[PDB]
């Protein structure tokens, strides 16, 4: 089978750089006949499937910016792409066609640098239907920021920091290159209801105060 | 527009069986030759077999870790490709796709894929979610936007599809992925709409949950 | 044809308000008296309130338990009567019909009545149904008659509205009353077919529960 | 406020009889200058609403049988059905609108007497799904019986019949006059995983045997 490698394995650029990334293969994918290299780049956005970008490794399927240019030869080959947009971020996958079995390499990832951006928060208290199941999840978001470290703190009556929380950040996203991130602090009911309190504080290294999102069970 | 949708993925034990299909459209789906390609995090992409024209006894090559266990299969009158799957392994779970081998006699290049269907082969057992509202704890105190939530809890395997409004409400969500827990998973997603939609109008969270065949709308209320 | 849909029943707590609308087609609604009539196991039928014609500035009257509590209005534009209620009760439980007062000046018989939405007043929580398919032991030995199944478990209040392939299939079907237990209800949905429809087609268990606005869609698998 | 008072509160017949029932008011429901009764008929089928069967009295509604007859005057009436069909079953109600408030009688609930059938039984196992709760609710549907009292027994592994069962019966059916019932044996998994063979059985008051269903966990 040919064995196909791709370098590096990411990469992180930020909007109007170029990039290169490379993909080599165990024997030549050239048909000295045609003197056409069987060679195919896939682009696979954030919960997309992979799309064709270039073909004979360097012919572009119909619809792809120019920025984007296939070249090399024989087991050395190239994706480039002279300015990278936002949009661009992606897994890209080089792929042979000389022989059966067809065959891939392990992709270079594509992230984005961008500019520091601050999150959206919201937080909400358990849903009462899940009460009625005894389970109290407290949960919050944390949309569209940057960079992805960012530290979520719970507090239970104001300042008593908890941690039975579970995090889970997106993908970057494709168009303005930020992260999302939920945080849900999940406890029994009967702990729940011994509290009145609940504030959810995004903070990232700064001198800047953290954002901050409370309610209070005694609304109700 | 050309478009191939897969359907069929769910839970298998190892040893079991599971027949996906990709229905094609846009196209004259007679004329090409068709690939299933699986996807998982251990081995990247990974074709699995292709089958070619009427003319050429619809021929069919495969992957060396699926041949004598897998078939693809064709069927021109309802421009559809299937997979059919016996003796299923932990190692054949994945993301199935379906593609479009290119026109062109000797380009193989698979120039249309499907969104893919989801195969997990394990021996737990299959799970429905919960799926709880998440409306802001007061619906008169707003701001210019409003954001909405929806918890999907205690499910497996994954994956599970969110909606709002049927997928009219596309714009301004966040669907998390989801976080394993004692054996179970947990997603949230939360959409953020004007505050002149919400409480003014019906917002509704949809789950979809394939491998346990549930739909479940919950209505997001004050 | 003529007909009356009411909607906005649900679960309220004593003391509480809720809102119920009836949409009326098939007649010139504008021409037409309106009432609401109420039903419960330990009062029986009771007529609520009236509302007349525009000419007559909308005149109403009530019946002596709800005045003061309750507003009858409609909307001929919207084709619709409203009951408003306040300061909700215990003994304001039961099922709401609108209903069209006959035509002539003098007749106030009902003539045509909608099917009606449920309305309970308590303290306790709403709590969503679990909902889980029954199918027979064994999908190839059969009889030339199927029949399958569809548990409703564990929600609070009552109704529930079980339907089977959206309502497509509705002969031989079996719904049968909830039985309260630890005060949660629970109840099985029976529905019968020739043994050609299962597991040849695909059978679908829908349940709607008003009160939590929750639709869960179950598919029978073998 | 009018009272009104019918009888009798329930009969019972069997296709083709002539059923009578009474509405009786406690002031005359007559409008002596246009020499009307003020009084109508509803008719309740199972599952439905109310439809309006006689108004004035006398007078049908389009669309009703004219095997139903009001008559009667000024406190007393009368509801006839001369030859009462399967489809009949329901309850009936008069309602006064001489004066308001407008109200209501009881209702004389008409059920229907049929020959004896047999039910239908069909036994299912607990759902899959719902052994993933910890429950295992073991149904049996009696379906399309008359008379309405049936005997469900629930037997586990071989005639050790069992109890901890829910049983819940329909209306009778408005076509065919028969009753249908669910019988449902809940225990939890580990008792339902004990044992092997799972059978329902129906009887009623008879020398002919039981129908019996059944199942048995090894069959996986």
């Known amino acids: 089978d040919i064995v196909m490698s791709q370098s590096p394995s990411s990469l992180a650029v930020s909007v109007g750089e170029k990039v290169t990334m490379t993909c080599?293969?165990?024997?030549?994918?050239?048909?000295?006949?045609?003197?056409?290299?069987?060679?195919?780049?896939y682009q696979q956005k954030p919960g997309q499937s992979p799309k064709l970008?270039?073909?004979?490794?360097?012919?572009?399927?119909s619809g792809v910016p120019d920025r984007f240019t296939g070249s090399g030869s024989g087991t050395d080959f190239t994706l480039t792409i002279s300015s990278v947009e936002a949009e661009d971020l992606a897994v890209?996958?080089?792929?042979?066609?000389?022989?059966?079995?067809?065959?891939?390499?392990?992709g270079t990832k594509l992230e984005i640098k961008r500019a520091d951006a601050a999150p959206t928060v919201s937080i909400f208290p358990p849903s009462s239907e899940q009460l009625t199941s005894g389970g109290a999840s407290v949960v919050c978001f944390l949309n569209n920021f940057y960079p992805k470290d960012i530290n979520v703190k719970w507090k239970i009556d104001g300042s008593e920091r908890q941690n039975g929380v579970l995090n889970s950040w997106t993908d970057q996203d494709s168009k303005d290159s930020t992260y999302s991130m939920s945080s849900t602090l999940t406890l029994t009911k009967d702990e729940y209801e011994r509290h009145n309190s609940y504030t959810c504080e995004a903070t990232h290294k700064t001198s800047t105060s953290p954002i901050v999102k409370s309610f209070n069970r005694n609304e109700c | 527009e050309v478009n191939l949708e897969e359907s069929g993925g769910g839970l298998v034990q190892p040893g079991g069986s599971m027949k996906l299909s990709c229905?094609?459209?846009?196209?004259?789906?007679?004329?090409?030759?068709?690939?299933?390609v699986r996807q998982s995090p251990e081995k990247g992409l990974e074709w699995?077999?292709?089958?070619?024209?009427?003319?050429?006894?619809?021929?069919?090559?495969?992957?060396e870790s699926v041949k004598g266990r897998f078939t693809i299969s064709r069927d021109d009158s309802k421009s559809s490709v299937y997979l059919q799957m016996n003796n299923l392994r932990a190692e054949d779970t994945g993301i199935?796709?379906?593609?479009?081998?290119?026109?062109?006699?000797?380009?193989?290049?698979?120039?249309?894929?499907?969104?893919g269907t989801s195969v997990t082969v394990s021996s737990a057992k299959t799970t429905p979610p919960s799926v709880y509202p998440l409306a802001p704890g007061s619906a008169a105190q707003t701001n210019s936007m409003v954001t909405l939530g929806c918890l999907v809890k205690g499910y497996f395997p994954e994956p599970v599809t969110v909606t709002w409004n049927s997928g009219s409400l596309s714009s301004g969500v966040h669907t998390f992925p989801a976080v394993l827990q004692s054996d179970l998973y947990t997603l949230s997603s939360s959409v953020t709409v004007p505050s002149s939609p919400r409480p003014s109008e019906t917002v509704t969270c949809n789950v979809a949950h394939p491998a346990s065949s549930t739909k479940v709308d919950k209505k997001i209320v004050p | 044809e003529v007909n009356l849909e009411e909607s906005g029943g649900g679960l309220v707590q004593p003391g509480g308000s809720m809102k119920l609308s009836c949409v009326a087609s098939?007649?010139?609604?504008?021409?037409?008296?309106m009432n609401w009539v109420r039903q419960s196991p330990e009062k029986g039928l009771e007529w609520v309130a009236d509302?007349?014609?525009?000419?007559?500035?909308?005149?109403?009257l009530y019946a002596e338990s709800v005045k003061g509590r309750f507003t009858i209005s409609r909307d001929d534009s919207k084709s619709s009567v409203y009951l408003q209620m306040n300061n909700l009760r215990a003994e304001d439980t039961g099922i709401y019909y609108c209903?069209?007062?006959?035509?002539?000046?003098?007749?106030?018989?009902?003539?045509?009545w909608g099917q009606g939405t449920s309305v309970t007043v308590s303290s306790a929580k709403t709590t969503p149904p679990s909902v889980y398919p029954l199918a027979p032991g064994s999908a190839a030995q059969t009889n030339s008659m199927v029949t399958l199944g569809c548990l409703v478990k564990g929600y609070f209040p009552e109704p529930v509205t079980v339907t089977w392939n959206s309502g497509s299939l509705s002969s031989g079907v079996h719904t049968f009353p909830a039985v309260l237990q630890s005060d949660l209800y629970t109840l099985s949905s029976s529905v019968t077919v020739p043994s050609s429809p299962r597991p040849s087609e695909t059978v679908t268990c829908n349940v709607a529960h008003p009160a939590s606005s929750t639709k869960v869609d179950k598919k029978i698998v073998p | 406020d009018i009272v009104m008072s019918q009888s009798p509160s329930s009969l019972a017949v069997s296709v083709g009889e002539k059923v009578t029932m009474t509405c009786k008011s406690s002031?005359?429901?007559?409008?002596?200058?246009?020499?009307?009764?003020?009084l109508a008929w509803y008719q309740q089928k199972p599952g439905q609403s109310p439809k309006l069967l006689i108004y004035?009295?006398?007078t049908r509604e389009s669309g009703v049988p004219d095997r139903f007859t009001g008559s009667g005057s000024g406190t007393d009436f009368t509801l006839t059905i001369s030859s009462v069909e399967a489809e009949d079953l329901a309850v009936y109600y008069c309602?006064?609108?001489?004066?308001?408030?407008?109200?209501f009688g009881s209702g004389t609930k008409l059920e229907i007497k049929r020959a004896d059938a047999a039910p239908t039984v069909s036994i299912f196992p607990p759902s899959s799904e719902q052994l993933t709760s910890g429950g295992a609710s073991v149904v049996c549907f009696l379906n399309n019986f008359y008379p309405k009292d049936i005997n469900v027994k629930w037997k586990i592994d071989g005639s050790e019949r069992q109890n901890g069962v829910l049983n819940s019966w329909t209306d009778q059916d408005s076509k065919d006059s028969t009753y249908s019932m669910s019988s449902t044996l809940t225990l939890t998994k580990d008792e339902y995983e004990r044992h092997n063979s799972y059978t329902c059985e129906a009887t009623h008051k008879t020398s002919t045997s039981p129908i019996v269903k059944s199942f048995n966990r090894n069959e996986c």
């Open positions: 098939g007649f010139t609604f504008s021409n037409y008296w």
């Open positions: 004035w009295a006398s």
């Open positions: 509302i007349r014609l525009k000419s007559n500035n909308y005149a109403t």
């Open positions: 309602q006064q609108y001489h004066s308001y408030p407008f109200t």
């Open positions: 002031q005359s429901l007559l409008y002596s200058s246009n020499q009307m009764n003020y």
């Open positions: 209903t069209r007062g006959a035509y002539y000046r003098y007749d106030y018989a009902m003539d045509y």
